Amino acid sequence: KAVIKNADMSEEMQADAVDCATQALEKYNIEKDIAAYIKKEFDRKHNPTWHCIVGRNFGSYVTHETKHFIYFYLGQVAILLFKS
Amino acid sequence: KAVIKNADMSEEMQADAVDCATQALEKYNIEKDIAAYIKKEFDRKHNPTWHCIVGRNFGSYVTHETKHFIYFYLGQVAILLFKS
Amino acid sequence: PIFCAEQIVIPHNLADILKAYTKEVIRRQPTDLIAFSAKYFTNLANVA
């Protein structure tokens, strides 16, 4: 289940982020494949640039533009997503 | 010591990044602090936009501005440093 | 900094001891398992 530690986006876009994370965790095995799936899928619809990091032990320092950011847990993986 | 798994910068810039990371590693024992330190020093050193992720388990897919990217290990910790 | 399942260490000498342990129980088949187990482990510690 999605424990959203830190999000700065609207509700629908957050829900779509969680759904895309679920599909990525279901379909791919290695981490970079999941990251690329998330980033490319959010490039396809939301806005043309995105950045994603999937892992278990990390905390970034980014410069995201407001209204787009998430850092949440799915299963046992931390997914960090932001546009810049 | 330091091994550069991936680089897309000039030799001087990569050397400066390695120096920044090793300098950070003697001050900060929490990983977000290393991310912050690196992000500030490349923020003031270069064109202001930057991004840094540090950890021991993560996989990413970042669209980075050309001629600016690095992914390298110090000790046991991986650092991904790039510009949007 | 444990973050993955495989990080948990299973000692080399663990299972053998455990089997010996269950041996004693299934030899005596007692009812106050906790007391007898405490006595047995304390005996093993004090003799080792």
Partner: peptide, 17 residues
């Protein structure tokens, strides 16, 4: 743009049992 800091803490993601 605005900044943001995240960090995986100890034991929050990893439920031992």
């Amino acid at each position: 743009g605005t900044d943001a800091i995240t960090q995986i803490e100890n034991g929050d993601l990893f439920d031992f049992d």
